[PDB]
C-alpha cells in the first residue's frame, strides 16, 4: 500500500519551502567566494558548476545541509590511470603550474590555497556568521547555527570521457542511444580523492539533473496526468530511508561509509533494469519502491554496486566498505522492510 509512502512524501514536500530561506544565505556566501577566487592567479577560471543552481541537496530530510561544487577548466589535460582502478587518475600537462609536483598535479597543494583563500574571505566580510570546519577534501562552512555547506573543487575537462566509461551509462534501452550520445558530449570532472596518492576521482554528478528532469522512455512522462510515474518518488524514499537509518545509528560507526550516492547508483541501475514507464506507474508506488529496496539489498549481500558510469569500479568492494558494515545495513533494511518501515512514520 502506497498510503504510508505518500504521507512521507507529503511531509517531505512541506519542508521544501524552508530551503528557499536557507539557500539565499548560501548564495551570498559563494558569490563573495567566487569573486575573491577569480582574481587569484590559479583560480581565474573558477565558477559554479551550474550558473544559477548554486547547490545540490544531499540531505532530503534536513534542509540545512547543502553541497556546492566549484569548477575549474583544465585545458590540454593529460590523465594517467592509477594502477587500473578505473576511477582514480593523475593529472599532468599555465595557471596551475604552482601545484605541479613535477609532471603531476598535486591535489592537496591546490586544496591548501583554495582552503586558504576561503578561510581568509570567510573572516574578512563576516557580515553574516560563517564558521569553517576543518577535518576531508570538502571545505565545510556553517552559516549561522543551522546551515552547513559542503564546497567541493573540481577540474573540468571538455574532452572525451576516459575509456573506463566506455560501457557505463547503460541508458540505451531506457532513454535511447541518441540521448546517451548527447550526454557523453558533455564535459567530465575530476575531484580530490580524500590508499594515499595525489590522484583524482572521475565525477559525473552533473549528469543526474539532466536525467531526473527527463526520465521516462516517453518524452511526455510526468507532463500530463495520464502518464505520471513514480521514479522520482522512489529515489526520494530510498534517500530518506538511508538518512533515517544513518540518523538512528549516529552513535555507532557502522553506517558512516554509506551515502545518498550509493542509493542513487542502485536506483539508476534499477532504472536500467526497468526501462518502461509502465513499470513505474504511480499506482504501484509501494511495489516499485520494493523493487528498489530489493535490488539494493541484493547489492549489499553480494558486495557489488557498480559505478553507474564506470562498470569496473565496485562501490561496495571490501576495500571500500567492510563486510560487517554491509551486513549491518542489510539487517536494518530487511527489518524495516518486514515491518512496513517504522523510520517513515517518525523523524
Ligand X SMILES: Cc1ccc(-c2cc(C(=O)O)c3nc(NCc4ccccc4)[nH]c3c2)c(Cl)c1
Give the residue numbers of the binding site for Zn(2+).
Answer: 215, 221-222, 229
Q: Is residue 261 near ligand X by the rule CB under 6 A?
A: yes
Q: Checking DSSP bridges between strand 147-157 and strand 188-192, what pairing results, if any?
A: antiparallel
Residue 258 interacts with which of Zn ion, ligand X, none, CB < 5 to 8 Å by class: none
Note the residues at the interface with Zn ion (CB under 5 A). 216, 221-222, 229
Annotated binding site for GTP: 51, 150, 201-208
User: At closest approach, how far in Å is the CB of 175 from ligand X?
Assistant: 9
φ and ψ of 130, to 5 deg:
-125, 125
CB 23, CB 55: distance < 8 Å: yes
Annotated binding site: 51, 53, 65-67, 150, 193, 201-208, 215, 221-222, 229, 239, 260-264
Q: Name the residue nearer to Zn ion (CB basis): 20 or 224.
A: 224
Alpha carbon 81 to its chain centroid, in Å, reads 22
C-alpha cell at 199: 590522484
CB 186, CB 180: distance < 8 Å: no
Q: Is residue 179 near ligand X by the rule CB under 6 A?
A: no
Q: Is residue 270 near ligand X by the rule CB under 6 A?
A: no
Q: Name the residue nearer to ligand X (CB basis): 118 or 266.
A: 266
Q: Is residue 161 near ligand X by the rule CB under 6 A?
A: no
- Tell me whether residue 283 is exposed, middle or buried, using C-beta atoms within 10 angstroms of its C-beta: 0 to 12, 13 to 18, 19 or more: exposed
245: which residues sit within 8 A by CB, 6+ positions away? 255, 329, 332, 333, 336, 343
User: At closest approach, how far in Å is the CB of 246 from ligand X?
Assistant: 11
The secondary element (H helix, E strand) that includes residue 19 is helix 16-38
Out of 157, 265, 314, 332, the residue judged to bind ligand X by CB under 6 A: 265
Q: How far apart are CA 339 and CA 333, in angstroms?
A: 10
User: At closest approach, how far in Å is the CB of 46 from ligand X?
Assistant: 19
Q: Is residue 199 near ligand X by the rule CB under 6 A?
A: no
In the 8-state DSSP scheme, what is residue 281? B
Q: Is residue 325 near ligand X by the rule CB under 6 A?
A: no
Q: Name the residue nearer to Zn ion (CB basis): 217 or 257.
A: 217
Taken in order 194, 43, 106, 50, the sign of the CA dihedral is positive
Binding footprint of ligand X on the chain (CB under 6 A) = 58, 67, 203-205, 207-208, 211, 259-261, 264-265, 268, 308-309
Amino acid at each position: 500500500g502506497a498510503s504510508k509512502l505518500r504521507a512521507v512524501l507529503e511531509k517531505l514536500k512541506l519542508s521544501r519551502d524552508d530551503i528557499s530561506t536557507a539557500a539565499g544565505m548560501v548564495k551570498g556566501v559563494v558569490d563573495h567566494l567566487l569573486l575573491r577566487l577569480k582574481c587569484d592567479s590559479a583560480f581565474r577560471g573558477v565558477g559554479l558548476l551550474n550558473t544559477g543552481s548554486y547547490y545540490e541537496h544531499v540531505k532530503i530530510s534536513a534542509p540545512n545541509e547543502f553541497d556546492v561544487m566549484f569548477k575549474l577548466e583544465v585545458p590540454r589535460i593529460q590523465l594517467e590511470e592509477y594502477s587500473n582502478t578505473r576511477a582514480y587518475y593523475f593529472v599532468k600537462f599555465n595557471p596551475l603550474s604552482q601545484f605541479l609536483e613535477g609532471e603531476i598535479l598535486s591535489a592537496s597543494k591546490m586544496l591548501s590555497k583554495f582552503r586558504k583563500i576561503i578561510k581568509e574571505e570567510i573572516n574578512d566580510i563576516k557580515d553574516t556568521d560563517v564558521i569553517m570546519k576543518r577535518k576531508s577534501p570538502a571545505v565545510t562552512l556553517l552559516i549561522s547555527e543551522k546551515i552547513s555547506v559542503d564546497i567541493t573543487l573540481a577540474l573540468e575537462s571538455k574532452s572525451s570521457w576516459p575509456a573506463s566509461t566506455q560501457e557505463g551509462l547503460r541508458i540505451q534501452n531506457w532513454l535511447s542511444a541518441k540521448v546517451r550520445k548527447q550526454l557523453r558530449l558533455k564535459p567530465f570532472y575530476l575531484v580530490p580523492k580524500h590508499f594515499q596518492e595525489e590522484t583524482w576521482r572521475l565525477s559525473f554528478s552533473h549528469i543526474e539533473k539532466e536525467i531526473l528532469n527527463n526520465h521516462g522512455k516517453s518524452k511526455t512522462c510526468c507532463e500530463n496526468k495520464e502518464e505520471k510515474c513514480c521514479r522520482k518518488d522512489c529515489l526520494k524514499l530510498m534517500k530518506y530511508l538511508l538518512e533515517q537509518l544513518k540518523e538512528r545509528f549516529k552513535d555507532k560507526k557502522h553506517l558512516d561509509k554509506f551515502s545518498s550516492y550509493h542509493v542513487k547508483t542502485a536506483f539508476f541501475h534499477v532504472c536500467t533494469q526497468n526501462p518502461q514507464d509502465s513499470q513505474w506507474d504511480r499506482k504501484d508506488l509501494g511495489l516499485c519502491f520494493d523493487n528498489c529496496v530489493t535490488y539494493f539489498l541484493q547489492c549489499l549481500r553480494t558486495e557489488k554496486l557498480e559505478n553507474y558510469f564506470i562498470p569496473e569500479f565496485n562501490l561496495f568492494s571490501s576495500n571500500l566498505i567492510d563486510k560487517r558494515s554491509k551486513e549491518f545495513l542489510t539487517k536494518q533494511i530487511e527489518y524495516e522492510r518486514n515491518n512496513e518501515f517504522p523510520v517513515f512514520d517518525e523523524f
